[PDB]
PDB file of C-alpha atoms and ligand atoms in Angstrom:
ATOM      1  CA  UNK A 684      19.677   1.374  13.893  1.00  0.00           C
ATOM      2  CA  UNK A 685      18.959   1.798  10.160  1.00  0.00           C
ATOM      3  CA  UNK A 686      15.873   1.713   7.781  1.00  0.00           C
ATOM      4  CA  UNK A 687      16.345   0.095   4.415  1.00  0.00           C
ATOM      5  CA  UNK A 688      16.114   2.376   1.167  1.00  0.00           C
ATOM      6  CA  UNK A 689      12.203   2.672   0.168  1.00  0.00           C
ATOM      7  CA  UNK A 690      10.684   0.682  -2.569  1.00  0.00           C
ATOM      8  CA  UNK A 691      11.186   1.814  -6.108  1.00  0.00           C
ATOM      9  CA  UNK A 692       8.795   4.589  -7.309  1.00  0.00           C
ATOM     10  CA  UNK A 693      10.623   5.622 -10.532  1.00  0.00           C
ATOM     11  CA  UNK A 694      12.236   3.328 -13.128  1.00  0.00           C
ATOM     12  CA  UNK A 695      12.512   4.972 -16.506  1.00  0.00           C
ATOM     13  CA  UNK A 696      13.110   1.559 -18.482  1.00  0.00           C
ATOM     14  CA  UNK A 697      10.093  -0.235 -16.873  1.00  0.00           C
ATOM     15  CA  UNK A 698       7.175  -0.307 -19.356  1.00  0.00           C
ATOM     16  CA  UNK A 699       4.050   1.416 -17.970  1.00  0.00           C
ATOM     17  CA  UNK A 700       0.473   2.337 -18.814  1.00  0.00           C
ATOM     18  CA  UNK A 701      -2.469   4.852 -17.895  1.00  0.00           C
ATOM     19  CA  UNK A 702      -5.431   2.450 -17.990  1.00  0.00           C
ATOM     20  CA  UNK A 703      -9.011   2.982 -16.747  1.00  0.00           C
ATOM     21  CA  UNK A 704      -8.343   0.308 -13.983  1.00  0.00           C
ATOM     22  CA  UNK A 705      -5.422   2.039 -12.832  1.00  0.00           C
ATOM     23  CA  UNK A 706      -7.252   5.457 -12.690  1.00  0.00           C
ATOM     24  CA  UNK A 707      -9.849   3.787 -10.485  1.00  0.00           C
ATOM     25  CA  UNK A 708      -6.984   2.505  -8.318  1.00  0.00           C
ATOM     26  CA  UNK A 709      -5.960   5.965  -7.776  1.00  0.00           C
ATOM     27  CA  UNK A 710      -9.387   7.944  -7.907  1.00  0.00           C
ATOM     28  CA  UNK A 711     -11.423   5.609  -5.902  1.00  0.00           C
ATOM     29  CA  UNK A 712      -9.163   3.074  -3.959  1.00  0.00           C
ATOM     30  CA  UNK A 713      -6.283   4.878  -2.923  1.00  0.00           C
ATOM     31  CA  UNK A 714      -8.159   8.099  -2.249  1.00  0.00           C
ATOM     32  CA  UNK A 715     -10.808   6.256  -0.088  1.00  0.00           C
ATOM     33  CA  UNK A 716      -8.244   4.552   2.034  1.00  0.00           C
ATOM     34  CA  UNK A 717      -5.919   7.665   2.388  1.00  0.00           C
ATOM     35  CA  UNK A 718      -8.696   9.779   3.912  1.00  0.00           C
ATOM     36  CA  UNK A 719      -9.532   7.079   6.427  1.00  0.00           C
ATOM     37  CA  UNK A 720      -9.079   7.855  10.230  1.00  0.00           C
ATOM     38  CA  UNK A 721      -6.784   4.878  10.445  1.00  0.00           C
ATOM     39  CA  UNK A 722      -4.804   5.566   7.219  1.00  0.00           C
ATOM     40  CA  UNK A 723      -1.932   7.620   8.949  1.00  0.00           C
ATOM     41  CA  UNK A 724       0.442   4.632   9.947  1.00  0.00           C
ATOM     42  CA  UNK A 725       0.300   3.410   6.313  1.00  0.00           C
ATOM     43  CA  UNK A 726       0.903   6.798   4.508  1.00  0.00           C
ATOM     44  CA  UNK A 727       4.703   6.318   4.519  1.00  0.00           C
ATOM     45  CA  UNK A 728       7.339   3.455   5.067  1.00  0.00           C
ATOM     46  CA  UNK A 729       7.458   1.943   8.335  1.00  0.00           C
ATOM     47  CA  UNK A 730      10.305   4.095  10.160  1.00  0.00           C
ATOM     48  CA  UNK A 731      11.832   1.213  12.348  1.00  0.00           C
ATOM     49  CA  UNK A 732      14.267   3.637  13.966  1.00  0.00           C
ATOM     50  CA  UNK A 733      11.571   6.094  15.136  1.00  0.00           C
ATOM     51  CA  UNK A 734       9.129   3.448  16.119  1.00  0.00           C
ATOM     52  CA  UNK A 735      11.914   1.428  17.855  1.00  0.00           C
ATOM     53  CA  UNK A 736      11.055  -1.791  15.758  1.00  0.00           C
ATOM     54  CA  UNK A 737      14.761  -3.033  15.103  1.00  0.00           C
ATOM     55  CA  UNK A 738      13.430  -6.551  13.994  1.00  0.00           C
ATOM     56  CA  UNK A 739      10.767  -5.025  11.491  1.00  0.00           C
ATOM     57  CA  UNK A 740      13.063  -5.363   8.470  1.00  0.00           C
ATOM     58  CA  UNK A 741      14.314  -8.674   9.677  1.00  0.00           C
ATOM     59  CA  UNK A 742      10.873 -10.060   9.332  1.00  0.00           C
ATOM     60  CA  UNK A 743       9.491  -7.867   6.536  1.00  0.00           C
ATOM     61  CA  UNK A 744      11.408  -8.409   3.191  1.00  0.00           C
ATOM     62  CA  UNK A 745       8.972  -6.958   0.810  1.00  0.00           C
ATOM     63  CA  UNK A 746       7.763  -3.505   2.637  1.00  0.00           C
ATOM     64  CA  UNK A 747       4.963  -1.679   1.221  1.00  0.00           C
ATOM     65  CA  UNK A 748       3.095   1.379   2.306  1.00  0.00           C
ATOM     66  CA  UNK A 749       0.367   3.884   0.720  1.00  0.00           C
ATOM     67  CA  UNK A 750       2.961   6.660   0.394  1.00  0.00           C
ATOM     68  CA  UNK A 751       4.689   4.322  -2.140  1.00  0.00           C
ATOM     69  CA  UNK A 752       1.569   3.206  -3.814  1.00  0.00           C
ATOM     70  CA  UNK A 753       0.449   6.999  -4.066  1.00  0.00           C
ATOM     71  CA  UNK A 754       3.771   7.953  -5.734  1.00  0.00           C
ATOM     72  CA  UNK A 755       3.682   4.912  -8.118  1.00  0.00           C
ATOM     73  CA  UNK A 756       0.089   5.884  -9.139  1.00  0.00           C
ATOM     74  CA  UNK A 757       0.958   9.336  -9.517  1.00  0.00           C
ATOM     75  CA  UNK A 758       4.186   8.716 -11.519  1.00  0.00           C
ATOM     76  CA  UNK A 759       2.012   6.082 -13.744  1.00  0.00           C
ATOM     77  CA  UNK A 760       4.617   3.331 -12.516  1.00  0.00           C
ATOM     78  CA  UNK A 761       2.454   0.315 -13.100  1.00  0.00           C
ATOM     79  CA  UNK A 762       1.750  -1.561 -16.270  1.00  0.00           C
ATOM     80  CA  UNK A 763      -1.459  -3.240 -14.959  1.00  0.00           C
ATOM     81  CA  UNK A 764      -4.189  -2.927 -12.061  1.00  0.00           C
ATOM     82  CA  UNK A 765      -2.817  -6.659 -10.833  1.00  0.00           C
ATOM     83  CA  UNK A 766       0.526  -4.917  -9.896  1.00  0.00           C
ATOM     84  CA  UNK A 767      -1.026  -2.245  -7.792  1.00  0.00           C
ATOM     85  CA  UNK A 768      -3.497  -4.509  -6.006  1.00  0.00           C
ATOM     86  CA  UNK A 769      -0.587  -6.695  -5.100  1.00  0.00           C
ATOM     87  CA  UNK A 770       1.062  -3.684  -3.512  1.00  0.00           C
ATOM     88  CA  UNK A 771      -2.083  -3.102  -1.294  1.00  0.00           C
ATOM     89  CA  UNK A 772      -2.354  -6.774  -0.484  1.00  0.00           C
ATOM     90  CA  UNK A 773       1.475  -6.831   0.406  1.00  0.00           C
ATOM     91  CA  UNK A 774       0.927  -3.797   2.659  1.00  0.00           C
ATOM     92  CA  UNK A 775      -1.927  -5.585   4.769  1.00  0.00           C
ATOM     93  CA  UNK A 776      -0.125  -8.900   4.985  1.00  0.00           C
ATOM     94  CA  UNK A 777       3.016  -7.453   6.186  1.00  0.00           C
ATOM     95  CA  UNK A 778       1.033  -5.884   8.982  1.00  0.00           C
ATOM     96  CA  UNK A 779      -0.499  -9.061   9.776  1.00  0.00           C
ATOM     97  CA  UNK A 780       2.722 -10.991   9.709  1.00  0.00           C
ATOM     98  CA  UNK A 781       4.705  -8.591  11.968  1.00  0.00           C
ATOM     99  CA  UNK A 782       1.983  -7.940  14.577  1.00  0.00           C
ATOM    100  CA  UNK A 783      -0.327  -9.820  16.933  1.00  0.00           C
ATOM    101  CA  UNK A 784      -4.156 -10.369  16.512  1.00  0.00           C
ATOM    102  CA  UNK A 785      -6.078  -7.570  18.181  1.00  0.00           C
ATOM    103  CA  UNK A 786      -3.085  -5.031  18.042  1.00  0.00           C
ATOM    104  CA  UNK A 787      -4.167  -1.449  17.427  1.00  0.00           C
ATOM    105  CA  UNK A 788      -2.292  -1.468  14.068  1.00  0.00           C
ATOM    106  CA  UNK A 789      -4.075  -4.925  12.865  1.00  0.00           C
ATOM    107  CA  UNK A 790      -7.287  -3.410  13.693  1.00  0.00           C
ATOM    108  CA  UNK A 791      -6.387  -0.340  11.541  1.00  0.00           C
ATOM    109  CA  UNK A 792      -5.134  -2.387   8.682  1.00  0.00           C
ATOM    110  CA  UNK A 793      -8.238  -4.557   8.945  1.00  0.00           C
ATOM    111  CA  UNK A 794     -10.612  -1.383   8.629  1.00  0.00           C
ATOM    112  CA  UNK A 795      -8.655  -0.271   5.512  1.00  0.00           C
ATOM    113  CA  UNK A 796      -8.633  -3.702   3.855  1.00  0.00           C
ATOM    114  CA  UNK A 797     -12.426  -4.079   4.203  1.00  0.00           C
ATOM    115  CA  UNK A 798     -12.840  -0.813   2.224  1.00  0.00           C
ATOM    116  CA  UNK A 799     -10.249  -1.896  -0.061  1.00  0.00           C
ATOM    117  CA  UNK A 800     -12.163  -5.023  -0.933  1.00  0.00           C
ATOM    118  CA  UNK A 801     -15.404  -3.214  -1.288  1.00  0.00           C
ATOM    119  CA  UNK A 802     -13.787  -1.029  -3.937  1.00  0.00           C
ATOM    120  CA  UNK A 803     -11.879  -3.556  -5.894  1.00  0.00           C
ATOM    121  CA  UNK A 804     -15.162  -5.693  -5.956  1.00  0.00           C
ATOM    122  CA  UNK A 805     -16.204  -2.898  -8.455  1.00  0.00           C
ATOM    123  CA  UNK A 806     -13.065  -2.605 -10.431  1.00  0.00           C
ATOM    124  CA  UNK A 807     -14.180  -1.586 -14.090  1.00  0.00           C
ATOM    125  CA  UNK A 808     -13.718  -3.919 -16.984  1.00  0.00           C
ATOM    126  CA  UNK A 809     -10.811  -2.728 -19.044  1.00  0.00           C
ATOM    127  CA  UNK A 810     -11.442  -0.291 -21.737  1.00  0.00           C
TER     128      UNK A 810
HETATM  129  C1  LIG B 746       2.521   0.290   9.747  1.00  0.00           C
HETATM  130  C2  LIG B 746       2.990  -0.800  10.779  1.00  0.00           C
HETATM  131  N1  LIG B 746       3.003  -2.122  10.743  1.00  0.00           N
HETATM  132  N2  LIG B 746       3.556  -2.613  11.698  1.00  0.00           N
HETATM  133  C3  LIG B 746       3.512  -1.696  12.610  1.00  0.00           C
HETATM  134  C4  LIG B 746       4.039  -1.860  13.993  1.00  0.00           C
HETATM  135  C5  LIG B 746       3.956  -0.467  14.698  1.00  0.00           C
HETATM  136  C6  LIG B 746       3.489   0.537  13.949  1.00  0.00           C
HETATM  137  N3  LIG B 746       3.553   1.753  14.862  1.00  0.00           N
HETATM  138  C7  LIG B 746       3.249   3.039  13.997  1.00  0.00           C
HETATM  139  C8  LIG B 746       2.556   3.911  15.331  1.00  0.00           C
HETATM  140  C9  LIG B 746       1.128   3.209  15.693  1.00  0.00           C
HETATM  141  C10 LIG B 746       1.258   2.713  17.018  1.00  0.00           C
HETATM  142  C11 LIG B 746       0.165   1.922  17.545  1.00  0.00           C
HETATM  143  C12 LIG B 746      -1.036   1.954  16.885  1.00  0.00           C
HETATM  144  C13 LIG B 746      -0.870   2.528  15.513  1.00  0.00           C
HETATM  145  C14 LIG B 746       0.189   3.285  14.975  1.00  0.00           C
HETATM  146  N4  LIG B 746       3.359   0.624  12.667  1.00  0.00           N
HETATM  147  N5  LIG B 746       3.295  -0.469  12.053  1.00  0.00           N
END
């Protein structure tokens, strides 16, 4: 069995910025979700080999996880807040696509998504 390479976290030719909204995404959003008791399955790419999920990467074609988001935020990989918000949404959506309602992993994603939505509701206006 094999995992794909992880999503890109470094690209020198990609234009990027350090905005107040992106700072909020790291200091408030990512940090809140990262410390949560249900964050652990989402702190690194899904390891389909170790978890014995050979169909995972046959179904999930745009993988995303908080370890990748954390690296992207720390490396100032993004141009805007929308790009980062899309990464969080991809992460939750993938979990719902792959799994069944009521599964433990889905309940965990739902708890993190609730907090995500609460924090993004207060995303500051751009400076
Ligand atoms: C992320 C992600 N997206 N879909 C899946 C499917 C399984 C999975 N297993 C990780 C270990 C685990 C088992 C039970 C409950 C919580 C975590 N992680 N995962």
